[PDB]
């Protein structure tokens, strides 16, 4: 029976015209991201299930020496996976994006395991031609580079898209909102990201990396809106701003993030400036110390646009002259903008800074709701063969 079993596998694998059609349409594009909440609990088997499938298929293609097929098979997988991430828009941006980051990482872990195996284990080098060995080692290595170049790509594509969703909500909910977007919408945006990376068994270093990136962006785009705002920067406004940023701080605190304050300093020190005393020269000196992230050209621009209330007394010309006096000295040392250039990419892939998932044997599994005739037949065949 083992003869007939192996024979059926070959015919299924050799025809990468049917298989490429099933994978791309049914598995990669026909992907169904499970509910991204810890209402229901997801095991790893339900998160990286397409990756586990693509591994089994690729493993058999490598076992029957179908190098010609496995090459064209994966060369479409990469193109299709990246095609999906780029086409991601709307309410699926966060859960689907994370979903593929987990799979690409799962796929990348296997190729690392394969390449590490073929170079360390001699049974491979001893059991094949010097030509064949130099072909596989070059085949798997090229594949590994393509996979880390895929994770790096789909991360930036996804992260640049996250920043686009924020900017629509971030500015209006931080600069304008006062306790049409609110801080509740912003914190909901982060709650979504948090729950996704927890439900999909994502390493918490990636979660730290994503939030850190987004926080510095919100810090930048909101500050650049404030420093151009005129007849707007009042004491009451500065107090309202501090509360909004406080809610962001308290969210980071309660969600395993300790560097959130460091990412929001430009907003924090802006709020502090709009509240602290600015009457005498003595006050400005203390102000320069508190606002250590700001520059004299920024302090001058922020102070001069301060909204003095009906009752409040304006800032003396003696102070303004003293501030501009400091700006004079600062500019001479550099022998020059007031805005903060937001980090819009390219970004370093956080997954590339964590050890690859130590690959262990995979359970032959495929969801019942999926409709992949040839692909399922393969997995079922290897299951019987393993027992034999």
């Amino acid at each position: 029976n083992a003869t007939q079993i192996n024979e059926e596998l070959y015919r299924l694998l050799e025809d990468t015209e049917i298989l490429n059609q099933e994978i791309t349409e049914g598995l990669l594009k026909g992907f169904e991201v499970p509910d991204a909440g810890v209402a229901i609990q997801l095991s790893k088997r339900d998160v990286v299930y397409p990756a586990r499938i693509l591994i089994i298929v690729l493993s058999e293609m490598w076992r029957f020496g179908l190098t010609k097929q496995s090459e064209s098979f994966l060369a479409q997988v990469l193109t299709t996976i990246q095609k999906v991430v780029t086409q991601l828009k709307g309410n699926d941006l966060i859960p689907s994006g994370v979903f593929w980051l987990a799979n690409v990482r799962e796929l990348y872990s296997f190729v690392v395991f394969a390449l590490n195996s073929i170079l360390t284990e001699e049974t491979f080098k001893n059991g094949m031609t010097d030509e064949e060995y130099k072909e596989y080692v070059s085949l798997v290595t090229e594949l590994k580079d393509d996979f880390e170049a895929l994770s790096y790509n789909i991360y930036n594509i996804w992260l640049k898209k996250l920043q686009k969703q924020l900017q629509k909500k971030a500015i209006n909910a931080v600069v304008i909102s006062e306790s049409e977007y609110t801080m509740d919408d912003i914190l909901t945006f982060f709650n979504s990201i948090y729950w996704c990376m927890k439900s999909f068994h994502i390493e918490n270093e990636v979660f730290h990396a994503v939030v850190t990136t987004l926080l510095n962006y919100v810090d930048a785009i909101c500050f650049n809106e404030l420093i151009m705002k005129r007849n707007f920067l009042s004491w009451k406004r500065g107090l309202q701003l501090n509360y909004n940023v406080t809610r962001l701080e308290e969210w980071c605190k309660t969600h395993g993030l300790t560097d959130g304050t460091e990412c929001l300093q430009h907003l924090i020190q802006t709020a502090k400036l709009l509240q602290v005393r600015k009457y005498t020269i003595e006050d400005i000196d203390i102000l320069r110390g508190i606002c250590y992230s700001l520059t004299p050209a920024q302090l001058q621009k922020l102070i001069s646009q301060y909204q003095v209330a009906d009752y409040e007394s304006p800032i003396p010309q003696e102070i303004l002259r003293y501030v501009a006096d400091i700006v004079k000295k600062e500019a001479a040392l550099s022998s020059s903008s007031i805005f903060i250039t937001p980090e819009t990419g390219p970004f370093t892939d956080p997954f590339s800074l964590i050890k690859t998932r130590k690959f262990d044997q995979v359970e032959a599994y495929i969801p019942a709701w999926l409709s992949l005739p040839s692909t399922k037949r393969i997995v079922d065949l290897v299951a019987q063969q393993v027992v034999q």
Partner: peptide
């Protein structure tokens, strides 16, 4: 000859 890995349970 091929390239055989042991990856299933």
């Amino acid at each position: 000859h091929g390239f055989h890995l042991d990856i299933l349970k």
